[PDB]
Amino acid sequence: TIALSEIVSVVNTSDGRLEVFGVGTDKAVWHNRQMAPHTGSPWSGWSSLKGQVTSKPVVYINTDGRLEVFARGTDNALWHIWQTATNAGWSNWQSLGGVITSNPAIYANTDGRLEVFARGADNALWHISQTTAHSGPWSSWASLNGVITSNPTVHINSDGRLEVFARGTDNALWHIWQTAPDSNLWSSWESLNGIITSDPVVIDTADGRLEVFARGADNALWHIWQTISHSGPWSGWQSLNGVITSAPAVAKNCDNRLEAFARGTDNALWHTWQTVSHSGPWSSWQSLNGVITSAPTAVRDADGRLEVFARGTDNALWLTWQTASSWSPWISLGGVLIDASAIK
Amino acid sequence: TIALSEIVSVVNTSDGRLEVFGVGTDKAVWHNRQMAPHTGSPWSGWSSLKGQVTSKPVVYINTDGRLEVFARGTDNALWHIWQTATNAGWSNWQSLGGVITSNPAIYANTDGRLEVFARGADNALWHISQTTAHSGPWSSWASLNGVITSNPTVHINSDGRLEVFARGTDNALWHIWQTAPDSNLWSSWESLNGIITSDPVVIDTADGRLEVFARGADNALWHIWQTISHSGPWSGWQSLNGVITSAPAVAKNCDNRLEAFARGTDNALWHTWQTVSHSGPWSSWQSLNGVITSAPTAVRDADGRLEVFARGTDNALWLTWQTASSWSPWISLGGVLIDASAIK
Ligand SMILES: C#CCO[C@@H]1O[C@@H](C)[C@@H](O)[C@@H](O)[C@@H]1O
Ligand SMILES: C#CCO[C@@H]1O[C@@H](C)[C@@H](O)[C@@H](O)[C@@H]1O
Ligand SMILES: C#CCO[C@@H]1O[C@@H](C)[C@@H](O)[C@@H](O)[C@@H]1O
Ligand SMILES: C#CCO[C@@H]1O[C@@H](C)[C@@H](O)[C@@H](O)[C@@H]1O
Ligand SMILES: C#CCO[C@@H]1O[C@@H](C)[C@@H](O)[C@@H](O)[C@@H]1O
Ligand SMILES: C#CCO[C@@H]1O[C@@H](C)[C@@H](O)[C@@H](O)[C@@H]1O
Ligand SMILES: C#CCO[C@@H]1O[C@@H](C)[C@@H](O)[C@@H](O)[C@@H]1O
Ligand SMILES: C#CCO[C@@H]1O[C@@H](C)[C@@H](O)[C@@H](O)[C@@H]1O
Ligand SMILES: C#CCO[C@@H]1O[C@@H](C)[C@@H](O)[C@@H](O)[C@@H]1O
Ligand SMILES: C#CCO[C@@H]1O[C@@H](C)[C@@H](O)[C@@H](O)[C@@H]1O
Ligand SMILES: C#CCO[C@@H]1O[C@@H](C)[C@@H](O)[C@@H](O)[C@@H]1O
Ligand SMILES: [Cl-]
Ligand SMILES: [Cl-]
Ligand SMILES: [Cl-]
Ligand SMILES: [Cl-]
Ligand SMILES: [Cl-]
Ligand SMILES: [Cl-]
Ligand SMILES: [Cl-]
Ligand SMILES: [Cl-]
Ligand SMILES: [Cl-]
Ligand SMILES: [Cl-]
Ligand SMILES: [Cl-]
Ligand code: NA
Ligand code: NA
Ligand code: NA
Ligand code: NA
Ligand code: NA
Ligand code: NA
Ligand code: NA
Ligand code: NA
Ligand code: NA
Numbered sequence A, B: 001t002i003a004l005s006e007i008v009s010v011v012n013t014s015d016g017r018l019e020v021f022g023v024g025t026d027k028a029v030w031h032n033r034q035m036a037p038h039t040g041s042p043w044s045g046w047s048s049l050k051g052q053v054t055s056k057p058v059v060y061i062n063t064d065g066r067l068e069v070f071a072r073g074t075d076n077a078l079w080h081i082w083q084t085a086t087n088a089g090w091s092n093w094q095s096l097g098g099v100i101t102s103n104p105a106i107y108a109n110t111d112g113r114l115e116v117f118a119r120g121a122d123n124a125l126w127h128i129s130q131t132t133a134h135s136g137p138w139s140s141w142a143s144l145n146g147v148i149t150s151n152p153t154v155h156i157n158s159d160g161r162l163e164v165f166a167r168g169t170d171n172a173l174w175h176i177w178q179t180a181p182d183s184n185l186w187s188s189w190e191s192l193n194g195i196i197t198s199d200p201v202v203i204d205t206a207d208g209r210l211e212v213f214a215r216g217a218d219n220a221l222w223h224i225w226q227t228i229s230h231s232g233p234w235s236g237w238q239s240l241n242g243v244i245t246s247a248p249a250v251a252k253n254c255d256n257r258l259e260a261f262a263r264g265t266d267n268a269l270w271h272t273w274q275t276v277s278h279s280g281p282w283s284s285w286q287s288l289n290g291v292i293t294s295a296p297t298a299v300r301d302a303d304g305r306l307e308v309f310a311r312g313t314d315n316a317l318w319l320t321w322q323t324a325s326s327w328s329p330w331i332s333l334g335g336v337l338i339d340a341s342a343i344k
Helices: none
Strands: A009-012 A018-023 A029-033 A058-061 A067-072 A078-082 A105-108 A114-119 A125-132 A135-138 A142-145 A153-156 A162-167 A173-177 A201-204 A210-215 A221-228 A231-234 A249-252 A258-263 A269-273 A297-300 A306-311 A317-321 B008-012 B018-024 B029-033 B058-061 B067-072 B078-082 B105-108 B114-119 B125-132 B135-138 B142-145 B153-156 B162-167 B173-177 B201-204 B210-215 B221-228 B231-234 B249-252 B258-263 B269-273 B297-300 B306-311 B317-321
Touching: A009 A058, A009 A297, A018 A058, A058 A105, A067 A114, A105 A153, A114 A162, A153 A201, A201 A249, A210 A258, A249 A297, A258 A306, B008 B058, B008 B297, B018 B058, B058 B105, B067 B114, B105 B153, B114 B162, B153 B201, B201 B249, B210 B258, B249 B297, B258 B306, B269 B306
Parallel strands: none
Antiparallel strands: A009 A018, A018 A029, A058 A067, A067 A078, A105 A114, A114 A125, A125 A135, A125 A142, A153 A162, A162 A173, A201 A210, A210 A221, A221 A231, A249 A258, A258 A269, A297 A306, A306 A317, B008 B018, B018 B029, B058 B067, B067 B078, B105 B114, B114 B125, B125 B135, B125 B142, B153 B162, B162 B173, B201 B210, B210 B221, B221 B231, B249 B258, B258 B269, B297 B306, B306 B317
């Protein structure tokens, strides 16, 4: 097991609007969209993209601006659905085959080819990619081996090499990387040690370093980073303290200051932020109240403000966002959302 | 002729630092680099990349983070130099051939292939591209025809299609675009009318629209935009008033509010910005003082603040930046810079 997961995936679209994707009580993927590219825009309300899924659905934006949603099907294959043109109609659901046992994780290579990562039937890391920029057809499936016990997360280094993070059978954070951008040649697996009790969360800092966050054995929020832009040595593990009861979420403020969010022991949303600037020391933890039943999902909107989403006690998706002074009151976006994560 | 040009090219690097590139009294390309990814970082001092150039040198970042600098050579061919690895050593200068009669303009396609645009010996628009993502060899040159009378400027639409802007023989703003992302198929030329007396300056908005700024026949700053995300019809020309004596520079604040900069009749730096939000009305023009002998160059740094560069009365490069309350006083980065613009 791992800490409680995020309930939605979110994207800031090609036209600057937030769109959130989750799973309904009918096992379809539903989505909810800002009308306008601003903090506090009205929302569409929940709308179904149909299908029947058995993982968290994960939205990604192609390099031509088209949204694409990936999810495990009822046959355990990887399935996907995409906008046929930027901000336009959706394709039918289509299978990418395989047999997967985690949520999918997606990134664009430097050549615009989406690459998708998931755990396999064998508990190894597997991957598949677009054969040309922002387009099918897709490659055959292949394995990066290893044996992993969390959902994988992928990011891109500031030199263009993809890098994947996952928990190992010893509960340490492990990782593996492309040897060159767009490459099919990957490193050996390497351990970054620690004991982690959530999915890892990875972000790129303003200064080009990968930084990984995860709940520890003591239920504190911990992090570890590349000390040099796209390069080792990594730092030691460092504690940001707290006691958290979900996976964390991390986003960059307007000024690049990292900010981490998680559910607290009182089930409120809590957060801690870098102070002064993006190189800065982290603040003490502070509560944003509420009573939540998922990990939070954080994202920076087109006004440069953080917006945080979490499921509530009524199973609706609730929302709060940064204002000048403070944070806004929690508001409900309604709906009934379930946690369909393929690893819990 | 066109309004006075910018003296440097600037990039916010893969690791978050500002680096500026200009032409020294020896006609070599020189550069100056922030040590750290923060407003008010100390600078390296000017350092030479050698070469002998007869255009403004134009820096662009490959999709793998490697800087690449483009410039017209003493033989009028397009020349370039690149980092051999991200943020590391530089190649030798190499020729991409052709005969060009403007500064070069560069954008990355959605497939990661850089494409460069320049006016040719025939006065038409020409282009050349990398044949694979962030790598040579380059394609053959081809023409998009037209007859142009300014430096061209390229940008990417929110659906991934490159689009190029230039002044025509009638002094109107003309443009031309890819019919699909990464394509060798382009539109016919189309006129956006108006009378322009500077190079056009293009930026993408938070909501995915191309917006173009130019000095008008009355020496006011004018602009015009796509009405629908990545699509015509375009707006009317609208005036932002002022009386300006250089090319404008435009950048996005970290909340996406556009902000334009230009030298005034008194040779000081002046600016006007969007208020409220990125969909807000523009402020009155305000002075940032200084006495400057080039157009200003504006860029957002890794603290989310705008920084503006301009040549001074002593031919050094000077710098002011946004602060909480105000703007910083002008500071000198030293050096002696010449205006090597191919079109004056
Ligand atoms: C519109 C609407 C809201 O619908 C609710 O929320 C959706 C996300 C689904 O769970 C539906 O089954 C449920 O009824
Ligand atoms: C076409 C289509 C959609 O298919 C549904 O949704 C897919 C994601 C799979 O779960 C299929 O097994 C299921 O029938
Ligand atoms: C080298 C290597 C691969 O290691 C495997 O996969 C890693 C991710 C860990 O789970 C190890 O405990 C396991 O043996
Ligand atoms: C190629 C290569 C090397 O990759 C880098 O250096 C490795 C030794 C690891 O520290 C990775 O996190 C990092 O991306
Ligand atoms: C250290 C600290 C901050 O607070 C702790 O961690 C927070 C996230 C909450 O869980 C509190 O209930 C708990 O006391
Ligand atoms: C404070 C507040 C807002 O409301 C609380 O937190 C929300 C996220 C919901 O769980 C409500 O049911 C709960 O009452
Ligand atoms: C070091 C240094 C600064 O050098 C000055 O500024 C450079 C940009 C060149 O013009 C040199 O010729 C001049 O001497
Ligand atoms: C190699 C090299 C450097 O060459 C100089 O700089 C290049 C950019 C060209 O102008 C050459 O013609 C000139 O000789
Ligand atoms: C069609 C076409 C191209 O038109 C040419 O190129 C345009 C950019 C203008 O300069 C016209 O005045 C000129 O005739
Ligand atoms: C394909 C296509 C259409 O291109 C768009 O629509 C055209 C009519 C122009 O407005 C361009 O500025 C824009 O890029
Ligand atoms: C006001 C001010 C700061 O300085 C002025 O503007 C600078 C940009 C230089 O031109 C100086 O030589 C001049 O004195
Ligand atoms: Cl609804
Ligand atoms: Cl379907
Ligand atoms: Cl993540
Ligand atoms: Cl700290
Ligand atoms: Cl944005
Ligand atoms: Cl010369
Ligand atoms: Cl070549
Ligand atoms: Cl050629
Ligand atoms: Cl421009
Ligand atoms: Cl930045
Ligand atoms: Cl000069
Ligand atoms: Na769009
Ligand atoms: Na966006
Ligand atoms: Na295979
Ligand atoms: Na990721
Ligand atoms: Na970064
Ligand atoms: Na950057
Ligand atoms: Na460097
Ligand atoms: Na451009
Ligand atoms: Na945009």
